């Protein structure tokens, strides 16, 4: 009893963990890739910047 | 609840381990003390809180940074049914572990019933001091049984003392300083004759 | 007396091999329990 009582404890807390895991990466990785979408949008301008000078 | 709370459990599967002879019986206490470990390892990581405010305001996909915390907070108030297990366990479990539960209490009462036994003699023998003290016929009610044994001596006429005896120490007490030491044979009767005689080629039986 | 494999009713214990291997045919019986809770917990909703 005392073994299944510590097993399901120490359990409930490891599914803790991994919940508030999920949700932080998932939330840091679309930040990840939020960054990524500005870089490419400000990157379209440099783009411009230069091909207006070739022309 | 993390600290102490796995010390009664060490000692008890080390006296089962310590218990163990045979290599066989060795093994399933390591299995079992594998399940043991198993259930009662320690999880301790440090929950990280999430404040939602802090990513909502910096930066984030609208609608996303509520939606996960909406999500989030659900799954966070479901929680295991402790209860239940603690029932199901108590109530029945592996009838075949019913196999030692009574095996190891009809084997218990065979050695209680030993343990009751010279638990008892000691008891009686509180009220019998200095054997010498007592007359004959008395001595031998508190022995019960010798007077009836010595009847049975008596009627098959096996009057030779110690011959029933595996080890007649009486006999070899009277020998310690006699000429041609012995003791009476196991079971001799003064009536039996197992004597022979033959007739050879040669004369007194040579 | 009926359900236990013995040449003699004069039980004697040098080994804890019988009751070792029923306690594990015992205790591991009852593993998969937080498991399956997990299943229900986390098959419910989906967080994405
Ligand atoms: C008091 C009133 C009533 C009295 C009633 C009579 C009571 C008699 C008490 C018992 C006497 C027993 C004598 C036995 C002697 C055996 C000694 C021995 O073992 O020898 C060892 C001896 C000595 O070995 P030992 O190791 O035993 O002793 C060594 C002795 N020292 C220490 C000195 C070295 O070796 C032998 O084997 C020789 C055997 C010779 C036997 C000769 C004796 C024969 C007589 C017995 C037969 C009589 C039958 C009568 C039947 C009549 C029927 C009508």
């Given at each position: ?32 890739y ?7 949008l ?14 | ?50 404040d ?91 022995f ?5 044994e010595?009847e ?25 300083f006699?000429w ?27 | ?27 591991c ?20």
């Amino acid at each position: 009893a005392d073994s299944i009582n510590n097993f399901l404890a120490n359990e409930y807390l490891r599914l803790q963990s991994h919940i508030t895991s999920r949700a932080l990466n998932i939330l840091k990785q679309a930040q990840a890739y939020e960054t990524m979408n500005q870089a490419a949008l400000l990157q379209k301008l440099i783009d411009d910047a230069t091909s207006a000078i070739d022309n | 609840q993390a600290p102490g709370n796995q010390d009664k459990i060490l000692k008890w599967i080390s006296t089962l381990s310590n218990k163990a002879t045979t290599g066989e019986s060795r093994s399933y206490c390591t299995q079992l003390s594998s399940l043991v470990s198993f259930y009662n390892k320690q999880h301790v990581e440090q929950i990280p809180t999430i404040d939602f405010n802090e990513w909502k305001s910096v930066i984030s996909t609208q609608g996303l940074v509520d939606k996960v915390k909406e999500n989030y907070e659900s799954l966070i108030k479901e929680q295991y049914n402790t209860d239940a297990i603690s029932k199901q366990i108590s109530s029945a479990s592996s009838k075949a572990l019913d196999d030692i539960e009574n095996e190891l209490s009809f084997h218990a009462a065979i050695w209680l019933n030993a343990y009751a036994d010279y638990t008892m003699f000691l008891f009686e023998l509180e009220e019998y001091n200095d054997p010498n003290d007592y007359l004959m016929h008395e001595n031998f009610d508190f022995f019960r049984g010798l007077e009836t044994e010595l009847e049975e001596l008596t009627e098959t006429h096996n009057y030779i003392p110690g011959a029933k005896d595996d080890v007649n120490l009486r006999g070899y007490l009277a020998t310690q300083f006699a000429w041609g030491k012995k003791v009476i044979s196991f079971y001799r009767h003064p009536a039996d004759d197992f004597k022979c005689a033959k007739a050879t080629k040669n004369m007194l039986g040579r | 007396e009926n359900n236990i494999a013995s040449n003699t009713y004069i039980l004697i214990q040098q080994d804890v091999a019988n009751m070792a291997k029923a306690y594990v045919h015992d205790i591991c019986g009852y593993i998969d329990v937080a498991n399956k809770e997990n299943v229900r917990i986390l098959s419910k909703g989906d967080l994405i």
